[model samples]
Target: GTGIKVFFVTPEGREIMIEGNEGDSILDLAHANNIDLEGACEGSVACSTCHVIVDPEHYELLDPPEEDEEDMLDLAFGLEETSRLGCQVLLRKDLDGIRVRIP
Candidate 1:
């Protein structure tokens, strides 16, 4: 499991590490690991239930959100400088060891 390592911080204020390979969506990895994150729209970017707060360090390196994703992000709760819909974020080598919080 030497692909990518993502740290998911729960609303309960705990950090849990999850693994994902390249191209894995943040939502996919969280759900597969039975994390608290939920994607009501199942990675469709149609719902804000998958909102996550990315660590500022990696946030600057992620691809910018698209128009549709931006719209959904606007409706997400717990907005932050790094607020993003987990479903829209794809894992990559540069993002390895990335940390995000379930919002």
Candidate 2:
């Protein structure tokens, strides 16, 4: 069975859907799929290049990011209630078909 799904949005509002994993880094997913995300920090939790605003509807399913992740978000492009670092997200079985947008 599948575990997760991710949708990436572009500045132009274009959406791209991809699969995810509970144990995989969101950034890694993009890399593996050739999604061309700007994960400049390389999943070190130091930069906000991989910042994304999660949909409020899906926020509850995700494990809240730690203070360090929030701190890095200060430099991210778009920050919102659903804002999250790609590295902080852990996909799960229940997250199968889950989607995300990157802008």
Candidate 3:
């Protein structure tokens, strides 16, 4: 339960598989790997720039989005049912093999 595996897909649909830490936020992992996602709100969930489209199969494993997060996602570029803000999507060990798309 100390590590996790995540797949990040760019808007262009390029998939990158990477190793991640258990407690790292999705934004943190993307930044650590130099991925193109932008955390414009400084990981504060203040903006929708960090929106990530999570795989629906894995989304249910996550804690439900907070009211503020939902509000922010409403303004996301291409919100999906499984979408979440990178800052708010903490990587849990149980979330190994999770995939997310930057939009």
* Best candidate (score: TM-score): 3
How should the candidates be ordered by lDDT, best one leading? 3, 1, 2
Per-residue lDDT tens digits of candidate 3, residues 1-102?
566899999988898999888789899999999888888999787998889999998899999999999998899988889999999988888899999999
- C-alpha RMSD of candidate 2: 1.7
TM-score of each: 0.94, 0.85, 0.95
Error of 2 at 66 (Å): 0.3
Tens-digit lDDT track of model 1 for 1-103: 5588899888988889877998999988888888878899988879999899999999999999999999888898889989999999999988989999886
lDDT tens digits, residues 1-103, model 2?
Answer: 6556777775567777877666887778877877666788788899988887777777787888899998888888778878899767777776666566676
User: Which sections of candidate 3 miss by over 4 Å?
Assistant: none
Candidate closest to the true structure, highest lDDT: 3
The residue pairs in collision within model 1 are none
lDDT for residue 84 in candidate 2, whole number 0-100 = 90
Which regions in candidate 2 have their CA more than 4 angstroms from the true location?
A: none
> In candidate 2, residue 20 scores what lDDT?
69
Instruction: List per-prediction Cα lDDT, in the order shown.
Output: 0.89, 0.76, 0.90
